[PDB]
């Protein structure tokens, strides 16, 4: 593998996680699990950085905004903490269903392979052709744009996704830290914790 | 019969035979494995049927919907979503309902009436949830429970099998939904969706009758 | 223990001032004398290594659940044992009491090929738990079935490292526990704990033995 990415920086694992036996399993599936975890963390961090950029300014959706434009517009995080419990619960449940669909090795075997104990290219959301729903389009490329593409372009995009995911992980961590302790940049608002809060306990 | 549990693929693909608490063998009362899984299938189907009926009854009781000329309509017209209007019923009527259910299950599970119909007990090589007809001791008794008007007297085996899979699936989902209702009634817990504002039966849902009957 | 303490430590190794390796120990034998001592070597290590690591978490944070919570944290955790309810103290000891009784069963120990430690078996070997009257998901040693695929060289290195970290922690916790009462015992620490009640008295705060 050797993870070309940045040619000057080869490997880099003080923690020797690469030659590991996570949950008493083989090394290859361990490397696959770490690759899937870092790719998912990168994707989530990129989405969170774009969401924080869009929520710092009042850019709420003007479609109806019955509850979106209700409060005012505050601590980017608070924005989340002000929203009702049903909204965040449905968001969490939809993410849980999407990741349950991602790991389903019957649909995956109909499409590709799973990350551990198989080939399983790290990061592959399967299609929506098996659940009892003619959904308009799948999660990966809903509006068909990359239907026909070169494999070399796909590999370059995967490397770019990994690198930009690490960069935006650093960026989102920096923004979240500057929300509570100003490291190196101005233009923060306040600290709005991290968990759900607002109700339950 | 252990490999006859491959019907869970037909119930739902992807998630196939899913038994973490591996009750597939776990010999019950010293019986064989096939008898144990037959008991499991019959208990699952019975729980699903009662859960579906209880769900519909929960909706009815929450939206009142009383009988027209019933003189047992002396129960309060507001009423908790369900467990108080069960509690407001006199104890003899609850006892008669329970005895009715017991009589009907003892009818379902007698081997004389089952083998006369032509189908054995559910742990002796029979379909779980069959409920035979009435060859009763002298009692004409029109209308058995299953399709009394005859809505499915003629039916292909594929349609019956699909209905059985649908029955099991809807039974599982109705168990989940009915206990979501009962949870939102007592120590809510189902704050997702809130279930649609059910007051709160402070008492125990598992407490039949007003009196304790010392048992 | 045999003279293979050179592997555990050179320079020293089978130091043994009080001889203790041939006192015949209830008339059992010399091999049984060695087997009992090696088990009590590491059983005392396993308790002390878990208790010293146990100390460093108790004094700062408490589990937020309820019963063993909301009692003061800026005190000696030896005193925090005395603040537990009586049912908690009994259940803690009896839970360990099951683990002691279960692990000494020779018919369980011969399921996995070993024997009781001073009848010829390995000194420290907790059973793999799969013979109980009712099944449980998680056993005691290697619960996730993680590191039993390691070779015997890592087990032999780990077994010697368990002993050597054991001897280091038995000094570690007891010298620390000698600092709570009789202050100024360890002039390296000398900045923690209070309370002169007996740490070797689990029920002193509840009743009296006579
Ligand atoms: C990273 C994931 C993420 C999460 C959890 C949220 C969370 C939320 N968004 Mg959001 N959003 C995100 C990414 C995210 N956003 C991105 C990437 C965009 C750009 C397309 C937006 C654009 C957006 C709009 C336009 C609106 C929200 C709104 C909301 C709130 C409902 C909730 C706090 C609504 C709201 O309450 O206003 C802030 C709303 O109107 N979001
Ligand atoms: C007095 C009436 C009565 C009687 C005799 C039975 C009898 C039975 N029911 Mg039952 N049931 C009843 C009322 C009754 N039911 C009511 C009112 C409901 C609605 C909540 C149910 C709901 C129900 C379900 C959901 C299930 C049963 C099941 C069973 C069977 C096994 C129960 C068991 O292990 O014993 C329990 C023993 C005692 C409670 C002790 C009896 C003490 C006296 C001697 C058995 C044929 C199970 C079954 O058939 O699965 C194979 C099953 O899954 N029942
Ligand atoms: C399975 C669980 C269950 C339980 C324990 C109860 C318990 C109760 N119901 Mg009830 N009910 C249920 C399901 C249930 N219901 C369902 C599914 C419906 C919709 C059909 C109803 C509709 C209903 C009405 C309209 C009324 C009650 C009433 C009552 C109370 C008095 C007893 C009585 O007359 O029952 C009578 C109930 C039945 C005969 C229904 C049970 C029969 C099966 C399970 C469902 C129907 C099958 C089929 C569609 C039959 C056609 C309709 C037929 C009822 C004419 C008692 C607390 C009365 C009340 O509130 O008094 C205070 C009342 O007026 N129920
Ligand atoms: C659809 C899935 C779903 C989800 C996401 C939740 C979410 C939750 N349930 Mg819940 N619940 C559900 C379905 C669900 N429920 C269903 C179907 C039932 C009926 C069987 C229950 C019955 C139930 C009870 C009885 C309780 C919860 C509780 C809780 C909360 C956990 C609090 C805690 O200590 O966590 C860690 C949380 C809000 C608890 C709660 O909110 O009270 C403290 C609680 O006591 N749930
Ligand atoms: C409705 C949804 C519509 C979606 C449309 C869409 O397609 O989306 C576009 C998309 C998908 C795609 C593809 C295309 C490129 C489009 C086409 C490709 O085809 C090819 C190439 O062949 C296929 C595919 C899949 O690749 C992906 C979008 C990705 C996106 C939007 C990525 C933002 C990262 C932000 C970063 C890195 C910034 C971090 C932030 C940083 C680094 C910082 O703040 C630095 C910081 O120093 C600061 C400044 C202050 C300091 O004190 C401290 C810190 C460290 C905090
Ligand atoms: C956060 C979250 O997850 O959501 C929350 C909130 C929310 C949504 C409220 C929840 C809920 C509650 C739910 C979803 C409850 C669901 C309840 C459910 C699904 C109840 C089934 C009844 C079925 C019946 C009565 C069947 C009758 C069957 C009849 C009348 C037949 O004769 C069948 C028939 O076949 C014969 C026998 C012969 C055939 O020839 C003809 C037909 C086909 C007619 C959740 C999921 O709990 C939690
Ligand atoms: C490859 C594989 O198989 O996995 C590997 C890795 C892995 C998973 C970790 C394994 C494991 C199991 C576990 C759980 C290992 C963890 C063991 C644990 C928890 C070991 C605690 C020791 C505590 C000590 C030594 C305390 C010394 C204490 C000392 C030195 C003192 O306090 C003395 C002192 O106080 C005085 C007296 C005065 C003070 O002023 C000064 C100091 C502080 C110096 C395996 C299975 O074994 C092997
Ligand atoms: C919101 C989260 C998210 C973000 C922010 C994000 C950003 C980027 C960027 C940065 C601009 C690049 C350059 C990039 C590149 C590629 N993405 Mg990403 N991507 C996200 C999520 C997914 C998912 C779910 C999938 C996916 C895919 C691919 C493939 C196709 C490879 C293939 O043909 O195998 C390539 C080349 C699919 C996949 O296979 O992942 C490897 C797929 O299912 N992506 N992606
Ligand atoms: C109130 C309780 C109750 C509910 C809510 C309920 C709901 C559904 C649903 C919708 C969710 C479907 C789709 C469905 C389908 C079938 N039911 Mg159910 N059913 C209930 C009770 C009974 C009883 C007592 C019997 C029975 C039967 C069948 C058969 C025939 C199979 C066959 O003859 O092979 C099929 C196809 C008979 C049986 O044999 O079950 C194996 C039988 O006597 N059902 N049933
Ligand atoms: C709180 C308690 C506790 C602590 C703090 C602790 C610390 C360490 C350290 C760190 C210094 C090492 C290096 C180490 C190493 C090994 N331990 Mg520990 N261990 C504890 C408990 C147990 C129990 C209950 C068992 C056990 C075992 C082994 C085996 C051999 C496994 C094998 O050979 O199969 C090895 C190599 C098992 C046993 O020896 O069986 C033969 C067994 O049952 N350990 N152990
Ligand atoms: C095998 C494990 C074990 C060991 C190795 C051990 C060592 C020592 C040492 C040596 C360092 C001393 C000096 C010592 C002293 C006292 N112990 Mg022991 N003790 C052990 C077990 C128990 C138990 C189970 C109890 C107990 C108690 C007391 C009381 C209180 C008497 C009183 O109340 O008058 C005193 C003074 C009882 C108690 O907690 O108070 C009711 C009680 O139940 N001990 N104990
Ligand atoms: C909460 C909320 C929001 C949100 C959000 C979201 C989606 C947040 C997501 C955040 C996310 C996804 C954060 C990633 C974390 C992963 C990390 C940090 C991994 C680091 C890993 C590190 C630092 C490893 C470093 C190493 O250097 C070491 C240790 C040795 C080196 O040799 C080798 C390497 C380099 C490997 C908004 C959008 C802000 C407002 C909204 O309203 C409500």
CSV table of N, CA and C in Angstrom, one decimal, chain B residues 29-122:
chain,number,residue,atom,x,y,z
B,29,UNK,N,-37.7,-27.9,29.2
B,29,UNK,CA,-38.3,-28.9,30.0
B,29,UNK,C,-37.8,-30.3,29.6
B,30,UNK,N,-36.6,-30.4,29.1
B,30,UNK,CA,-36.1,-31.7,28.6
B,30,UNK,C,-36.5,-32.1,27.3
B,31,UNK,N,-37.3,-31.3,26.6
B,31,UNK,CA,-37.8,-31.7,25.3
B,31,UNK,C,-36.7,-31.5,24.2
B,32,UNK,N,-37.1,-32.0,23.0
B,32,UNK,CA,-36.1,-31.9,21.9
B,32,UNK,C,-36.0,-30.5,21.4
B,33,UNK,N,-35.0,-30.3,20.5
B,33,UNK,CA,-34.7,-29.0,19.9
B,33,UNK,C,-35.8,-28.5,19.0
B,34,UNK,N,-36.4,-29.3,18.2
B,34,UNK,CA,-37.5,-28.9,17.3
B,34,UNK,C,-38.7,-28.5,18.1
B,35,UNK,N,-39.0,-29.2,19.2
B,35,UNK,CA,-40.1,-28.8,20.1
B,35,UNK,C,-39.8,-27.4,20.7
B,36,UNK,N,-38.6,-27.2,21.1
B,36,UNK,CA,-38.2,-25.9,21.7
B,36,UNK,C,-38.5,-24.7,20.7
B,37,UNK,N,-38.0,-24.9,19.5
B,37,UNK,CA,-38.2,-23.8,18.5
B,37,UNK,C,-39.7,-23.7,18.0
B,38,UNK,N,-40.4,-24.8,18.1
B,38,UNK,CA,-41.9,-24.7,17.8
B,38,UNK,C,-42.6,-23.9,18.9
B,39,UNK,N,-42.2,-24.1,20.2
B,39,UNK,CA,-42.7,-23.3,21.3
B,39,UNK,C,-42.3,-21.8,21.0
B,40,UNK,N,-41.1,-21.6,20.6
B,40,UNK,CA,-40.6,-20.2,20.4
B,40,UNK,C,-41.5,-19.6,19.3
B,41,UNK,N,-41.7,-20.3,18.2
B,41,UNK,CA,-42.5,-19.8,17.1
B,41,UNK,C,-43.9,-19.5,17.5
B,42,UNK,N,-44.6,-20.4,18.2
B,42,UNK,CA,-45.9,-20.2,18.6
B,42,UNK,C,-46.1,-19.0,19.6
B,43,UNK,N,-45.1,-18.9,20.5
B,43,UNK,CA,-45.1,-17.8,21.5
B,43,UNK,C,-44.9,-16.5,20.8
B,44,UNK,N,-44.0,-16.4,19.8
B,44,UNK,CA,-43.8,-15.2,19.0
B,44,UNK,C,-45.0,-14.8,18.3
B,45,UNK,N,-45.7,-15.8,17.6
B,45,UNK,CA,-46.9,-15.4,16.8
B,45,UNK,C,-48.0,-15.0,17.7
B,46,UNK,N,-48.2,-15.7,18.9
B,46,UNK,CA,-49.3,-15.3,19.8
B,46,UNK,C,-49.0,-13.9,20.4
B,47,UNK,N,-47.7,-13.6,20.7
B,47,UNK,CA,-47.4,-12.3,21.2
B,47,UNK,C,-47.6,-11.2,20.2
B,48,UNK,N,-47.3,-11.5,18.9
B,48,UNK,CA,-47.5,-10.5,17.9
B,48,UNK,C,-49.0,-10.2,17.6
B,49,UNK,N,-49.8,-11.3,17.6
B,49,UNK,CA,-51.2,-11.1,17.4
B,49,UNK,C,-51.9,-10.3,18.6
B,50,UNK,N,-51.5,-10.6,19.8
B,50,UNK,CA,-52.1,-9.9,20.9
B,50,UNK,C,-51.5,-8.5,21.0
B,51,UNK,N,-50.3,-8.2,20.5
B,51,UNK,CA,-49.7,-6.9,20.5
B,51,UNK,C,-50.4,-6.0,19.4
B,52,UNK,N,-50.7,-6.6,18.2
B,52,UNK,CA,-51.5,-5.9,17.2
B,52,UNK,C,-52.9,-5.5,17.7
B,53,UNK,N,-53.6,-6.5,18.3
B,53,UNK,CA,-54.9,-6.2,18.8
B,53,UNK,C,-54.9,-5.2,19.9
B,54,UNK,N,-53.9,-5.3,20.8
B,54,UNK,CA,-53.7,-4.3,21.8
B,54,UNK,C,-53.4,-2.9,21.3
B,55,UNK,N,-52.6,-2.8,20.2
B,55,UNK,CA,-52.3,-1.5,19.6
B,55,UNK,C,-53.6,-0.9,19.1
B,56,UNK,N,-54.4,-1.6,18.4
B,56,UNK,CA,-55.7,-1.1,17.9
B,56,UNK,C,-56.6,-0.7,19.0
B,57,UNK,N,-56.7,-1.5,20.1
B,57,UNK,CA,-57.5,-1.2,21.2
B,57,UNK,C,-57.0,0.0,22.0
B,58,UNK,N,-55.7,0.2,22.0
B,58,UNK,CA,-55.1,1.4,22.6
B,58,UNK,C,-55.5,2.6,21.9
B,59,UNK,N,-55.5,2.6,20.6
B,59,UNK,CA,-55.9,3.8,19.8
B,59,UNK,C,-57.4,4.0,20.0
B,60,UNK,N,-58.2,2.9,20.1
B,60,UNK,CA,-59.6,3.1,20.3
B,60,UNK,C,-59.9,3.7,21.7
B,61,UNK,N,-59.3,3.1,22.7
B,61,UNK,CA,-59.5,3.6,24.1
B,61,UNK,C,-59.1,5.0,24.3
B,62,UNK,N,-57.9,5.4,23.6
B,62,UNK,CA,-57.5,6.8,23.7
B,62,UNK,C,-58.4,7.7,23.0
B,63,UNK,N,-59.0,7.3,21.9
B,63,UNK,CA,-60.0,8.1,21.2
B,63,UNK,C,-61.4,7.8,21.6
B,64,UNK,N,-61.6,7.4,22.9
B,64,UNK,CA,-62.9,7.0,23.4
B,64,UNK,C,-63.5,5.8,22.6
B,65,UNK,N,-64.4,6.1,21.7
B,65,UNK,CA,-65.1,5.2,20.8
B,65,UNK,C,-65.8,4.1,21.7
B,66,UNK,N,-66.9,4.4,22.4
B,66,UNK,CA,-67.6,3.5,23.2
B,66,UNK,C,-68.7,2.8,22.4
B,67,UNK,N,-69.2,1.7,23.0
B,67,UNK,CA,-70.4,1.1,22.4
B,67,UNK,C,-71.6,2.0,22.6
B,68,UNK,N,-72.6,1.8,21.8
B,68,UNK,CA,-73.8,2.7,21.8
B,68,UNK,C,-74.7,2.4,23.0
B,69,UNK,N,-75.2,1.2,23.1
B,69,UNK,CA,-76.2,0.8,24.1
B,69,UNK,C,-75.6,0.0,25.3
B,70,UNK,N,-74.3,0.1,25.4
B,70,UNK,CA,-73.6,-0.7,26.6
B,70,UNK,C,-73.9,0.1,27.9
B,71,UNK,N,-74.4,-0.7,28.9
B,71,UNK,CA,-74.6,-0.1,30.2
B,71,UNK,C,-73.4,-0.2,31.1
B,72,UNK,N,-72.3,-0.7,30.6
B,72,UNK,CA,-71.0,-0.7,31.2
B,72,UNK,C,-70.2,0.5,30.8
B,73,UNK,N,-70.9,1.5,30.1
B,73,UNK,CA,-70.3,2.8,29.7
B,73,UNK,C,-70.3,3.8,30.9
B,74,UNK,N,-70.4,3.3,32.1
B,74,UNK,CA,-70.3,4.1,33.3
B,74,UNK,C,-68.9,4.5,33.6
B,75,UNK,N,-67.9,4.0,32.9
B,75,UNK,CA,-66.5,4.4,33.0
B,75,UNK,C,-66.4,5.9,32.6
B,76,UNK,N,-65.4,6.6,33.1
B,76,UNK,CA,-65.2,8.0,33.0
B,76,UNK,C,-65.0,8.4,31.5
B,77,UNK,N,-65.6,9.5,31.0
B,77,UNK,CA,-65.4,9.7,29.6
B,77,UNK,C,-64.1,10.4,29.1
B,78,UNK,N,-63.4,10.9,30.1
B,78,UNK,CA,-62.0,11.4,29.8
B,78,UNK,C,-61.2,10.1,29.7
B,79,UNK,N,-60.7,9.6,30.8
B,79,UNK,CA,-60.0,8.4,30.8
B,79,UNK,C,-58.5,8.3,30.3
B,80,UNK,N,-57.6,7.7,31.1
B,80,UNK,CA,-56.3,7.6,30.7
B,80,UNK,C,-56.2,6.9,29.4
B,81,UNK,N,-55.1,7.1,28.6
B,81,UNK,CA,-55.0,6.6,27.3
B,81,UNK,C,-55.5,5.1,27.2
B,82,UNK,N,-55.6,4.4,28.2
B,82,UNK,CA,-55.9,3.0,28.2
B,82,UNK,C,-56.0,2.3,29.5
B,83,UNK,N,-55.0,2.3,30.4
B,83,UNK,CA,-55.0,1.4,31.6
B,83,UNK,C,-56.1,1.7,32.6
B,84,UNK,N,-56.5,3.0,32.7
B,84,UNK,CA,-57.6,3.3,33.7
B,84,UNK,C,-58.9,2.8,33.2
B,85,UNK,N,-59.2,2.9,31.9
B,85,UNK,CA,-60.5,2.4,31.4
B,85,UNK,C,-60.5,0.9,31.4
B,86,UNK,N,-59.4,0.2,31.4
B,86,UNK,CA,-59.3,-1.2,31.7
B,86,UNK,C,-59.6,-1.3,33.2
B,87,UNK,N,-59.0,-0.5,34.1
B,87,UNK,CA,-59.1,-0.6,35.5
B,87,UNK,C,-60.6,-0.2,36.0
B,88,UNK,N,-61.2,0.7,35.2
B,88,UNK,CA,-62.6,1.1,35.6
B,88,UNK,C,-63.6,0.0,35.3
B,89,UNK,N,-63.3,-1.0,34.5
B,89,UNK,CA,-64.2,-2.1,34.3
B,89,UNK,C,-64.3,-2.9,35.5
B,90,UNK,N,-65.5,-3.4,35.8
B,90,UNK,CA,-65.7,-4.3,37.0
B,90,UNK,C,-64.9,-5.6,36.9
B,91,UNK,N,-64.6,-6.1,38.0
B,91,UNK,CA,-63.6,-7.2,38.1
B,91,UNK,C,-64.2,-8.5,37.5
B,92,UNK,N,-65.5,-8.7,37.5
B,92,UNK,CA,-66.1,-9.9,36.9
B,92,UNK,C,-65.9,-9.9,35.4
B,93,UNK,N,-66.0,-8.7,34.8
B,93,UNK,CA,-65.8,-8.6,33.4
B,93,UNK,C,-64.4,-8.9,32.9
B,94,UNK,N,-63.4,-8.4,33.7
B,94,UNK,CA,-62.0,-8.7,33.4
B,94,UNK,C,-61.8,-10.2,33.6
B,95,UNK,N,-62.4,-10.8,34.6
B,95,UNK,CA,-62.3,-12.3,34.8
B,95,UNK,C,-62.9,-13.0,33.7
B,96,UNK,N,-64.0,-12.6,33.2
B,96,UNK,CA,-64.7,-13.2,32.1
B,96,UNK,C,-63.9,-13.1,30.8
B,97,UNK,N,-63.2,-12.0,30.6
B,97,UNK,CA,-62.3,-11.8,29.4
B,97,UNK,C,-61.1,-12.8,29.5
B,98,UNK,N,-60.5,-12.9,30.7
B,98,UNK,CA,-59.4,-13.8,30.9
B,98,UNK,C,-59.8,-15.2,30.8
B,99,UNK,N,-60.9,-15.6,31.3
B,99,UNK,CA,-61.4,-17.0,31.2
B,99,UNK,C,-61.8,-17.3,29.7
B,100,UNK,N,-62.3,-16.3,29.0
B,100,UNK,CA,-62.6,-16.5,27.6
B,100,UNK,C,-61.3,-16.8,26.8
B,101,UNK,N,-60.2,-16.0,27.1
B,101,UNK,CA,-58.9,-16.3,26.4
B,101,UNK,C,-58.4,-17.6,26.8
B,102,UNK,N,-58.5,-18.0,28.1
B,102,UNK,CA,-58.0,-19.3,28.5
B,102,UNK,C,-58.8,-20.5,27.9
B,103,UNK,N,-60.1,-20.4,27.8
B,103,UNK,CA,-60.9,-21.4,27.1
B,103,UNK,C,-60.6,-21.5,25.6
B,104,UNK,N,-60.3,-20.4,25.0
B,104,UNK,CA,-60.1,-20.4,23.6
B,104,UNK,C,-58.7,-21.0,23.3
B,105,UNK,N,-57.7,-20.7,24.2
B,105,UNK,CA,-56.4,-21.4,24.0
B,105,UNK,C,-56.4,-22.8,24.3
B,106,UNK,N,-57.2,-23.3,25.3
B,106,UNK,CA,-57.3,-24.7,25.6
B,106,UNK,C,-58.1,-25.4,24.5
B,107,UNK,N,-58.9,-24.7,23.8
B,107,UNK,CA,-59.5,-25.2,22.5
B,107,UNK,C,-58.5,-25.3,21.4
B,108,UNK,N,-57.6,-24.3,21.3
B,108,UNK,CA,-56.6,-24.3,20.3
B,108,UNK,C,-55.6,-25.4,20.4
B,109,UNK,N,-55.3,-25.8,21.7
B,109,UNK,CA,-54.2,-26.7,21.9
B,109,UNK,C,-54.6,-28.1,22.3
B,110,UNK,N,-55.9,-28.4,22.3
B,110,UNK,CA,-56.3,-29.8,22.5
B,110,UNK,C,-55.9,-30.7,21.3
B,111,UNK,N,-55.3,-31.8,21.6
B,111,UNK,CA,-54.8,-32.7,20.5
B,111,UNK,C,-56.0,-33.5,19.9
B,112,UNK,N,-57.1,-33.6,20.5
B,112,UNK,CA,-58.2,-34.3,20.0
B,112,UNK,C,-58.8,-33.5,18.8
B,113,UNK,N,-59.0,-32.2,19.0
B,113,UNK,CA,-59.6,-31.3,18.0
B,113,UNK,C,-58.6,-31.0,16.9
B,114,UNK,N,-57.3,-31.0,17.3
B,114,UNK,CA,-56.3,-30.7,16.3
B,114,UNK,C,-56.1,-31.8,15.3
B,115,UNK,N,-56.0,-33.1,15.8
B,115,UNK,CA,-55.8,-34.2,14.9
B,115,UNK,C,-57.1,-34.6,14.2
B,116,UNK,N,-58.3,-34.2,14.7
B,116,UNK,CA,-59.5,-34.4,14.0
B,116,UNK,C,-59.6,-33.5,12.8
B,117,UNK,N,-59.1,-32.2,12.9
B,117,UNK,CA,-59.0,-31.3,11.8
B,117,UNK,C,-57.9,-31.8,10.8
B,118,UNK,N,-56.9,-32.5,11.3
B,118,UNK,CA,-55.9,-33.1,10.4
B,118,UNK,C,-54.5,-32.5,10.6
B,119,UNK,N,-54.2,-31.9,11.7
B,119,UNK,CA,-53.0,-31.2,12.0
B,119,UNK,C,-52.6,-31.2,13.4
B,120,UNK,N,-51.3,-31.6,13.7
B,120,UNK,CA,-50.9,-31.9,15.0
B,120,UNK,C,-50.6,-30.7,15.9
B,121,UNK,N,-50.1,-30.9,17.1
B,121,UNK,CA,-49.6,-29.9,18.0
B,121,UNK,C,-48.4,-29.1,17.4
B,122,UNK,N,-48.2,-27.9,17.8
B,122,UNK,CA,-47.2,-27.0,17.2
B,122,UNK,C,-45.8,-27.4,17.7
